[PDB]
């Protein structure tokens, strides 16, 4: 959400996100199904499926997104350009 | 990622996965193979895959490769007594070559187990010393015994600072 006022940007972004919902498949409703190593543009994301109780040992943004998704246990290393949007 | 093709070959797990440990007789192994031709394919794979593992399990056995020196690929083992062993590896697969050399010149499981037991006898549980060599450093780590003074101060009657004061 991009706006002149911060509150307007918050409202725009949060109202427009719900029209762009992904459904994230989870394994046993606590983790991802397999290790996912990908590169988006200049950012490498390497995610490891972990057993229960391992927790979210991920980048802070990834911790937030995983809490939103409903992923409890996962490891994640971000390499290359640490760009929030990428 | 890890460079090259089949980068698993450059991992300690793959190197330790070898099963061929040559007897003390074997000193040199000359691997003659051809870089082209269907019949030598297995031999090529044997050089590409199994040669590192062998050399890892046998750090002192010399291994020397030769390319396109003979029309057929073969291995020649030189033993410490002067005996030479010729293994014709044509039309065979690399797994077959590994099994054959393990059978004819590789130590069996029993010998490896005996060596491992002789190594294990070197580490005695009852020995006390540094963690590098012994499970425990001091007898104070054993429950029931008098604990370390650094953790539990000793009674004044068990410390010489007060024994000398009482005697004097």
């Amino acid at each position: 959400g991009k706006a002149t006022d911060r509150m307007d940007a918050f409202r725009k972004a949060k109202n427009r996100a719900v029209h762009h919902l992904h459904y994230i498949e989870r394994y046993e409703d606590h983790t991802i199904f397999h290790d996912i190593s990908l590169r988006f543009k200049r950012t490498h994301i390497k995610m490891k499926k972990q057993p229960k109780g391992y927790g979210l040992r991920c980048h802070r943004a990834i911790i937030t997104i995983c809490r939103l998704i409903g992923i409890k246990d996962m490891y994640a290393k971000v390499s290359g350009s640490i760009n929030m949007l990428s | 990622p890890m460079k090259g093709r089949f980068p698993i070959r450059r991992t300690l797990q793959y190197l330790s996965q070898g099963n061929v440990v040559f007897k003390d007789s074997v000193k040199v192994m000359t691997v003659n193979y051809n870089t082209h031709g269907e019949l030598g394919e297995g031999a090529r794979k044997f050089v590409f895959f199994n040669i590192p593992q062998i050399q890892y399990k046998n750090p002192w056995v010399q291994i020397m490769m030769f390319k396109n020196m003979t029309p057929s690929p073969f291995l020649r083992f030189y033993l410490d007594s002067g005996e030479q062993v010729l293994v014709d590896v044509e039309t065979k697969s690399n797994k077959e070559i590994m099994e054959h050399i393990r059978k004819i010149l590789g130590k069996n499981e029993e010998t490896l187990r005996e060596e491992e037991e002789e190594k294990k006898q070197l580490s005695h549980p009852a020995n006390f010393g540094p963690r590098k060599y012994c499970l425990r450093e001091c007898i104070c780590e054993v429950e029931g015994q008098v604990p370390c003074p650094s953790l539990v101060p000793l009674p004044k009657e068990m410390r010489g600072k007060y024994k000398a004061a009482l005697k004097a």
Binding site: - | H124, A126, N127, F128, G129, C138, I139, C140, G144, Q145, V146, C148, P149, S150, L154, M158, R159, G160
Partner: protein, 115 residues
């Protein structure tokens, strides 16, 4: 470290902390440091009584026999430990100290009775 002369000896290398003695029975050069390098550790000895009121002694008898056969000497404390264990005859000094203690206690008893 090559030493001039010397010989293997079975002895007690002192360990533990201050006021907490704990000996390790080891085979080592007599010229080597007391707590320094040792050829082989042959056991342990905790002089301080534990909760059960015991002084634990551990003796690798097989290796002790091997080293004595190999020519290793013995220190007096180690000889007394083995004599107490029954592995050797009681050391003459153990018996003599026992007799001296008996004489001393008898003299104390006689003095107390005379008082």
């Amino acid at each position: 470290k090559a030493y001039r002369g010397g010989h293997l000896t079975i002895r007690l290398a002192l360990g533990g902390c201050t006021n907490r003695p704990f000996y390790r029975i080891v085979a080592a050069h007599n010229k080597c440091p007391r707590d320094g390098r040792f050829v082989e550790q042959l056991g342990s000895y905790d002089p301080l009584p534990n909760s059960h009121g015991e002084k634990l002694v551990a003796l690798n008898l097989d290796r002790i026999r091997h080293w004595i056969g190999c020519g290793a000497h013995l220190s007096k404390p180690m000889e007394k430990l083995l004599g107490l264990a029954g592995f050797f005859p009681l050391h003459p000094m153990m018996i003599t100290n026992a007799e001296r203690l008996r004489r001393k206690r008898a003299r104390e008893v006689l003095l107390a009775s005379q008082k």
